[PDB]
Amino acid sequence: MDIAIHHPWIRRPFFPFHSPSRLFDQFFGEHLLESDLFPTSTSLSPFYLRPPSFLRAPSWFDTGLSEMRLEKDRFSVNLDVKHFSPEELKVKVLGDVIEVHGKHEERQDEHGFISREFHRKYRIPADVDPLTITSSLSSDGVLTVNGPRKQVSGPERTIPITREEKPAVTAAPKK
Template sequence: MALLPYLLDDLRPRRIRDQLFGLDLSPDDFLADIVDRPMLSVRKYIRPWRNLAAVARDVGSTIKSDKDKFQVNLDVQHFDPEEISVKTSDGYVVIEGKHEERKDEHGYVSRHFTRRYALPEGCNPETVESRLSSDGVLTVLAPKVSESKNERAIPITQTGPVRRKAHEEQEMNGSAEEEAIEKTPQKKRKK
């Protein structure tokens, strides 16, 4: 049933203002209002599928939240690093990108977006990190605080000789003292 609007979309006439944001215009889009409809009917049938493929490639953002972390990946390839800001505010991560009008292959364009993501419980806003990859994907990561259960693992550190060796040394020292006592004259021995 989700494909039904895309299939029926072909029945309605196309206009240049119907372009999906971020997708290129085809030459048919310019000719649709000028040329007779029957000439373009076959191409019009194929066009929605081309749009579906382009929309599927442009996922925009992905959110992953598991027991260890909350992570957002956002495609910001149209923005320079200094045009993007990431901040936390009232339990939300707010990502904003804005660039002034500039020339591209289709003319002039200016872009601005704001995205807000609620931080899940267990995420400390002070530990949120962001990274921008060379291909324009912004990753925002918030590690979740582990629950303390008044239980803590204590590391074991090895020091000194093993107990058996210490006991053997003590026995050896004890027998050496006995030998020394036996060698001393009886006059000096105290009873």
């Protein structure tokens, strides 16, 4: 459905040299372009590219915490229930949705119990994943989801595909 590719992040790591295409050629072999080595920009072939430095060059700030890879944007979405302690907050992440449940009792009574509760949530299959986003909090009951952000809006639909291996699951805008 959604027309979407990380075309700037694909172009970026080929260009930082005395040639913007030798960084394909030297990482697919070296200067044996009849035996297939491709001219890059608009004639490209596999991301074979296995010589590890290329997969690290565009963002060593993604750490290299696994392999291939070619890296990612980073962002956060806030599930800030502005009430209670974190003990009252429960969290669940699920494909296309992220949700939290703030579950407090304000007060007990001779008669029973005074519940006050919150259901904060986003449906955002381009931006939050049960995956490339991890999470955190603050003691106000504020739940944060955070990290190397989702960048996939694939025609299939269930796309949490990155085992800390960020491309090819970087293939979208922030949409």
